[PDB]
Design a protein around this ligand. Structure first.
Ligand SMILES: CNc1nc(Nc2ccc(C(=O)O)cc2-c2cccc(C(F)(F)F)c2F)nc2ccc(C(C)C)cc12
Ligand SMILES: CNc1nc(Nc2ccc(C(=O)O)cc2-c2cccc(C(F)(F)F)c2F)nc2ccc(C(C)C)cc12
Lengths: 132, 132
């Protein structure tokens, strides 16, 4: 089966659909139907552990997104966070500070470039190798 | 006891008097590791901030989190705290009109991780109940 990708965002919808649509080129997006409480917590936890990579849109402040990122770090997951400074917000220091430039990355982006940034991210460290 | 008070930067401005009341009450039970962060007008290095909060979180006997304001930082600290199996109390005000994230309400096991809905006037009596 294809790699499993976890898309994390705040429960924007047009941008989230573009992110999920692009990530489907790299594998199954486990949270695709969520994008489209104990039971919810358990299901997201099951999917986070299954994920090969966690891609989180962290522009909208969310306790849920933050919590899933904290659990993901504790699971030693490969994490990419996407933040849009054009929102006007200052990203939480806890999320910027968690970055280590390798396993946990935080990229500031402009809405128009998100598809190109996701291709860049998987070209540098693919989940499936390219054909010859 | 070492007590970790977890609140949001936004809540530290909009709920300043309420955060001061919570920190003041918590001091009757032990040392509040984050007292100086709550007293500050909120950055000095995001990695330094992350490492400091993570050191205090690791050392804490109990984490008391005010989760009424959505915050990626408060969510992240709660996710790291659950991975450490910290004893956690989350305080949420439904009069705010907010719907607390399913991820936070769903993390409750009702004993180790508890989430209490409250009205601001009763917070001192509720913290006395919790530590009694
Ligand atoms: C509210 N319903 C369900 N939420 C969730 N996760 C959340 C919970 C809270 C938060 C928050 O911002 O606090 C955000 C999320 C969330 C996580 C990943 C992606 C997205 C996306 F942005 F893509 F949509 C999210 F919103 N997981 C689910 C998993 C199964 C089911 C049923 C099918 C069983 C229901 C749910
Ligand atoms: C922003 N500055 C500093 N933040 C923090 N933690 C945060 C980071 C982000 C968030 C967020 O909501 O996203 C919230 C917190 C936070 C954590 C616990 C208590 C509070 C309280 F509400 F009580 F105030 C918090 F706000 N730790 C620090 C630790 C040392 C220093 C020195 C420079 C003085 C600075 C800081």
């Amino acid at each position: 089966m294809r790699p499993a990708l976890y898309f994390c965002g705040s429960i924007d919808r047009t941008l989230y659909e573009r992110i999920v649509s692009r990530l489907r080129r790299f594998g199954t997006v486990l949270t695709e139907h969520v994008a489209a409480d104990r039971l919810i917590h358990e299901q997201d936890l099951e999917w986070l552990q299954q994920a090969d990579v966690v891609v989180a849109e962290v522009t909208q402040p969310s306790l849920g997104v933050g919590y899933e990122l904290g659990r993901a770090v504790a699971f030693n997951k490969r994490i990419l966070c996407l933040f849009r400074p054009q929102s006007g917000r200052v990203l939480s220091a806890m999320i910027r500070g968690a970055a280590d430039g390798s396993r946990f990355q935080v990229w500031d982006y402009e809405e128009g470039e998100v598809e190109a940034l996701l291709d860049r991210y998987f070209e540098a460290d693919p989940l499936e190798e390219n054909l010859y």
